[PDB]
Every structure is written in C-alpha cells, then in structure tokens.
Design a protein around this nucleic acid. Structure first.
Ligand SMILES: [Mg+2]
Ligand SMILES: [Mg+2]
Length: 734
RNA sequence: UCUCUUGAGUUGGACAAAUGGCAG
RNA sequence: UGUCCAACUCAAGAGA
C-alpha cells in the first residue's frame, strides 16, 4: 500500500483541524424560474418569500441550493412574485443527486467563509484578519495583526481544515501625521487604508486637494450634512483640522474618508527602506514552531469560544475538532556520506561541510592549465583569491597550478569578449571571469561565448564576494568544489542499494521572456551511484514537439548510460518539478505515454520501468516535531505518508533550518511502473537530497530537480540558445 | 553572478466567472 | 469579483 515503514517512529503534528461532518439529507436543490430573472439580489428576495417553509441554512449560489433539513416535498413547485417589476415567478425544486463529495469541499469553504465572518473578522483579500489580537510594536507606532486563511479539503483522513497564519501591518499614527511629516503625494494611492471606528478596510483610488470637512454630503439621499456632524452623530467624535485633504474611494458613489481618523496599512517606501523595522517585524513574522503552534491554538480557541460558530456548525451538524492533528510519522535513518578513502554518517543536522572541507573528494581533476580574467581594478582581489584556491584545493584532492592571469582593458562587455576569443584554446581547462559588479547583459554575453561558440567550462564570480576576509576562506572552498564540479570530477557519493536505476530531472523555464519559446531542461545520472550526469536542453515554441525533444533527450541520456556502464537501466525514475495544481492531468495522460512509447527501440522489447514524481517546494502544510508537549522542527528525514496525503504521495522534511519553521516537500507520484515498494522510493528520494554538489548537506528537493532547474534557468535567461554538446557530460550550469 | 535556507513587499497567467456593504 | 500557481528585488541566518 501507500504505507512505508523504514525508520524510527517519531510523534509529529500538522496544522490541520479534522472535521467529522456526515453530509446526508442535504441533497442539492435545483432552483428554476420560468420568467427570466438573472440578478442575485432579486433572486434572493424572491426566494425569501417562502423562506419559513425552507429552513435557515441557505447556501444559494444564485443557481442551485443546499439545505440539510428536508422540505415537505421532493420536487417542490411553488410560486413567487418580483417587486421591481412584479413578475410572477414559478418555483421548480428538484433533487439532483447525492453521488459524491466533489463539491462538498466548495460547500464547506462557503460555510467557513461565513463562519469567519461570524467572528467579527475583517476580510482583506485572502485573509480574515483579527482586530482584538494585535501584536503591538510601540516603537515605530506600527501594529501587527494576525491573519488566518482557512482552506478546507479532503485528505486521507476525512476532511481537514488547513490553516496558514499571515500578518499584515496596521499603522497607528493618524494619516494627517503622515501628511505633516511628508512636507515638514504618491504613497497614499493604492494604499489599503482603514478607519478605526468600525475597523472597515478601504482601498483608495485618488486624492483631491480641494475639499474639507466643511463640505456637506446628502445623507441617504436626504439632506446635506457636513462630515463633522455626520461623524459626531454616528460615532461620537470630532475633527480638528479644517482645510485638510480628503481621500476618495469608489467601488466597481464617491466615498470621502477624512485623513485624521484614517490609519494607513502596508508599508511605505521609507518604511521598507529601514532595516531596523524589518528586524523588528522579523521576530513576529519569522516564528519558530513554538510560537507558531501557540498562534494556531489561539485561533482554535477563539473559534470554539464563540457560540455563533458552535451553533452554526451544529445547524449543519458537522463537528469540529478541538486540537491540531496529532499524528505519528517516522524518521528515516542518517545517511553514510562517502568519499575516496573515507566515510562519515551525516549529522543530526545533515550538514557535512566540515568533513567535506578536509577530506579527499572522489574524483579530482588536476587544474593544470587555466586562466583567470579580471579588470585591472580588481588585481588584488583576484590574486588574493587565487592563492586561497591553492591553500584549500590540496586538502580536498584537487591539484592547482599557477593560472594565466589576464588583464582585460576595461569592464565593457566588448573587451571581455575579445579577451575570451583571443584566449580560448584546446589547452585550457577552465576560465575564471571576475566582474566588477552584476550586469545581466555582460554575464549573458560571456556565458554565450563560453558555452555555445567556444565551449569551455566557465566560472564567474563577482568582485564583491572576494573582498571580505574572515569569510573568503569558505568562499574559496565553495568555488573550488563548484569548479571541480564543472570538470567531470565527482565530489562525494552516498550508498545506493538500488542497482541499475537511472534517474532523471526535468524543468521548464517558468517565464514569458524570449518570444514565449518554452525552454526545457534535462539531466540524468550515468553511473549507479548518481555521481555523474548528462545535461541537455530543448527549446521550441510548442507544447508537443517540445515533448518530442524531451523524448530525444532522454533517449540520448539512456544511450550515454550504456556507453559508461555496459548495460541498461532496469528502472527509470523521472523527477518533474513545479507542476502546480493546474495541469497535473496532462503529464500522466500524454507525457508518460510518450516516454514508454520509444524505449523498446534500443533493445529486445526494452520496456524500462518508468515512475514519474512531481515535486512541490511551496505548500501551506507544516509538520511539527512534538517532544513531550513542546513543539520543534522535525529533524531531517521525517516522512509522513499518512492522514494528510491524498494519493500515493508523501511529505518529506529533508532540509535543516536555523530561522523559523522548516517547510516539508510534497512529492506526488503521478505514474508508477517501477515496481518499487513505496519504502524504497521514499528512501531513494531522501538519498538524492544529499547529492546536489552546490551544497554539502541536504537541499529541499532532490538533486535532479535542482540541476535541471539551474540548467533551464541558465538557458532561458542568458543563452537563449542550446549550449554546445561538448559540455553534456559535465555540469557546466552550476 | 560563491551557495542554500526562512520571512516581507511587488509582478503576470492559467482558470472560473459579476460582490454581503451600509458605508459616505 | 475571487482563487491556485510561478518569476525577479530587499532584509536576515549559516559558512577558519
Ligand atoms: Mg523549476
Ligand atoms: Mg554557479
């Protein structure tokens, strides 16, 4: 089954409130009116005529209806009459069906968007902010409100109310204070102002520097009344200024908001400019799991400590739970990092930087012939850096010889390009370019030349990272491993019990920059220990023939497998990426058929066992580690394939964090033929987390996903073209 | 562009579709 | 009129 059992069980907790609603007798009621009447307001008024006979549990979308209590007729047929025109309306009620809960999710979402209103919360976009539970910051005069975003769904364990807490700031000084301290024009427009007397938000359209409270608006189409009298009579307050501006708002008449009882929101430009403000608001926004779970329990307490919600739920009859989703996941074992003539079991943090910086990498290419490349201003920064590579490569097995320093005339791209053209040759192994600063055009120009026209593995590094001693040592130590990566010398490895199991990672450039050309990205191991790779690209303005070049790419990769292993992979595991919740049906229905089509060509009915996987990094879910009764981030490698998965997927916490809560990674398995028990696939997806040669440690997603992503993001932002085919067997994109 | 991570504010695009508000 | 997605910029943590 979906279950997997490898490691030591750990008690966890997610941010879900399971529901126990038993939705019966609430069958959909179809509303039909013979007289054409299409106006939500009018339809509601018409329906209200026979209200008492129906119930008090309206869910009316304007076309259909849901109510749990049976009305005293199956196909009820009554009559009503309008009032704007008086047309007699014919009621036709029909029991539609009770087949499946593919929309009960929608019904529950609606009733909860109503419940969150029942608690006197102020909807603002996606968020239902609170106003009785601010987080004062009485040093910037600011203030911070918590925002809940409930999104019910159906999981393996019934229905679960996901919950995500988001904060949106609410200043406190009156807007007139801002006007005063702006003189002694353009920040207000677009600012979501709100008034304090009733805690009602107000988006702003424009300002008019010609009006005052002296002006009188006709009240309810009645008599003219000055704003001062209006506010005194309706809110018992007064206004001091007499010639101040007024703030204008118009929905999809004109609304005048006085700039003394208005309180801005969001942040200004100078507000974001400061970094002390950011540091202050980082304490409350970047919340460790302790305060996070406390803020969740605060929400649930506020939910169940108000009758309205209780009797509304009881009216719908579905019971809400009183505590987070207690659970029991498991923790996969640590992973044996290998080297040449060594080994080590990763930390509890799974970060073996110290061990890697002083151990012998597996394959190290002697960097005999190479050339630095810098503008004269950065002589020292370059030379000082080079020496460091000679003090940190010998420890790790790389042998470095004196480079061939080059002094480009001037920083203009033209000069760099001429220098590279006159410098490349068959005898160079790598070129190092040091830029005075980051200019996207320059970097793209250099990378086209080093990857397309004259293929040589390049390494750029800006003239700011290499100017800070007491940290330059590790910068050199990282550049050395990256450079050794772009030469075909693998760095470290990890034990793999799956023999002859190739791996593949695909990504598609997520943008609309270059003619909407739909770049691709491909990478596929070529040895049983996932140490070497094979990077190819495909860029076409089609969504099918692009799949055809992915076919050709993976055929080429599977060939390269044979050319270096004297066999063929018994299993192929493809790691898609970034495919949201929008088109996950297209993959399993077109891509997988395409894949399994053309594999028998190279052998006797060669049908290698494919298995796709979709990998999501951003998600609202959050797994917690529960030791006793306190909450803490899970240690790396805590699988959860129970009670929150939907269909043969699993969450996984492979990262380690030092700042706030750790975000699990959601691996859907959208096609399975590999005959891998889910335990082995989970442990493999954990292993590959360790094999991304840009970070000694564990990364949020597997290695192939990140490699393919960097390849696509290079080809689609700098090269705009296919990189040469001499650089396939290396990793030139790091 | 040395590299990963977690928050914040902007941005457009794949869909569906026309608002809970009595504010002024 | 709202939602599920995905890019870039700023700030911060870790790097003997
Ligand atoms: Mg991607
Ligand atoms: Mg790189």
């Amino acid at each position: 089954s979906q279950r997997g059992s490898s490691g030591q069980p750990v008690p966890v907790s997610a941010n879900y409130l399971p529901l126990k609603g038993n939705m019966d007798g609430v069958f959909k009621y179809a509303v039909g009116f013979n007289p054409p009447v299409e106006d939500i307001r009018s339809r509601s008024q018409l329906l209200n005529e026979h209200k008492e006979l129906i119930g008090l549990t309206r869910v009316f979308d304007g076309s259909t209806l849901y109510v749990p209590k049976r009305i005293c007729e199956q196909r009820l047929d009554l009559m009503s009459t309008r009032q704007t025109d008086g047309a007699s309306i014919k009621v036709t009620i029909s029991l539609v069906d009770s087949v499946k809960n593919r929309d009960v999710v929608q019904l529950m979402n609606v009733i909860f968007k109503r419940i969150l209103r029942s608690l006197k919360l102020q909807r603002i976009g996606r968020d239902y902010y609170d106003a009785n539970s601010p987080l004062e910051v009485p040093q910037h005069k600011m203030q911070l409100w918590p925002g809940y975003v409930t999104a019910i769904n159906r999981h393996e364990g019934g229905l679960m109310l996901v919950l995500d807490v988001s904060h949106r700031v609410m200043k406190t000084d009156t807007a007139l204070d801002f006007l005063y301290e702006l003189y002694h024009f353009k920040q207000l427009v677009g600012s979501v102002v709100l008034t304090r007397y009733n805690n009602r938000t107000y988006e702003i359209d424009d300002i008019a520097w010609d009006k005052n409270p002296r002006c009188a608006f006709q009240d309810h189409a009645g008599s003219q009344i000055t704003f001062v009298d209006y506010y005194k009579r309706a809110y018992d307050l007064d206004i001091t200024d007499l010639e101040q501006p007024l703030l204008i708002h118009r929905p999809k008449e004109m609304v005048c908001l006085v700039p003394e009882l208005c309180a801005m929101t969001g942040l200004t430009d100078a507000a974001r400019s400061d970094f002390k403000v950011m540091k202050d608001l980082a304490v409350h926004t970047r919340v460790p799991p302790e305060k996070r779970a406390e803020s969740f329990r605060k929400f649930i307490q506020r939910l169940n400590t108000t009758k309205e919600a209780s009797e509304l739920l009881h009216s719908w009859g579905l019971v809400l739970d009183s505590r987070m989703l207690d659970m029991q996941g498991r923790r996969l074992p640590p992973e044996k990092i290998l080297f040449k003539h060594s080994s080590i079991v990763a930390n509890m943090e799974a970060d073996w930087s110290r061990e890697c910086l002083k151990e012998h990498v597996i394959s190290a290419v002697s960097l005999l012939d190479w050339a630095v490349l810098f503008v004269r201003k950065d002589q020292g920064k370059a030379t000082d850096f080079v020496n460091m590579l000679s003090k940190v490569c010998p420890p790790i097995g790389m042998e470095v010889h004196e480079p061939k320093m080059v002094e480009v005339v001037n920083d203009r791209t033209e000069s760099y390009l001429r220098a590279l053209r006159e410098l490349i040759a068959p005898r160079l192994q790598m070129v190092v370019i040091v830029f005075p600063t980051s200019r996207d055009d320059r970097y793209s120009a250099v990378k086209k030349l080093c990857c397309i026209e004259s293929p040589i593995p390049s390494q750029v590094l800006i003239a700011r990272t290499i100017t800070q001693q007491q940290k330059l040592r590790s910068v050199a130590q990282k550049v050395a491993l990256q450079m050794n990566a772009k030469l075909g010398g693998e760095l470290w490895a990890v034990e793999i019990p799956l023999k002859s199991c190739m791996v593949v990672g695909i990504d598609v450039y997520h943008d609309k920059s270059y003619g909407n050309k739909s770049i691709a990205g491909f990478v596929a191991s070529t040895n049983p220990s996932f140490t070497r790779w094979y990077s190819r690209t495909a860029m076409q303005e089609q969504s099918q023939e692009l799949i055809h070049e992915l076919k050709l790419c993976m055929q080429a990769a599977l060939k390269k497998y044979n050319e270096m292993n004297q066999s063929l992979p018994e299993r192929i595991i493809v790691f898609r990426d970034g495919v949201g919740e929008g088109r996950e049906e297209y993959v399993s229905e077109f891509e997988v058929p395409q894949f399994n089509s053309c594999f028998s060509i190279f052998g006797e009915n060669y049908c290698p066992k494919l298995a796709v996987v979709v990998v999501q990094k951003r998600i609202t879910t959050r797994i917690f580690g529960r030791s006793g009764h306190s909450y803490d981030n899970p240690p790396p490698g805590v699988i959860v394939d129970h009670t929150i998965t939907k269909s043969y997927d699993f969450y996984l916490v492979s990262q380690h964090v030092r700042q706030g809560t750790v975000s699990p990674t959601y691996y859907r398995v959208i096609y399975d033929k590999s005959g891998l028990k889910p335990d082995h696939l989970q442990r493999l997806t954990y292993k590959l987390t360790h094999m991304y040669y840009n970070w000694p440690g564990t990364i949020r997603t597997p290695a192939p996903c990140n490699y393919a992503h960097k390849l696509a993001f290079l080809v689609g932002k700098s090269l705009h073209r296919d990189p040469a085919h001499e650089l396939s067997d290396r990793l030139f994109f790091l």
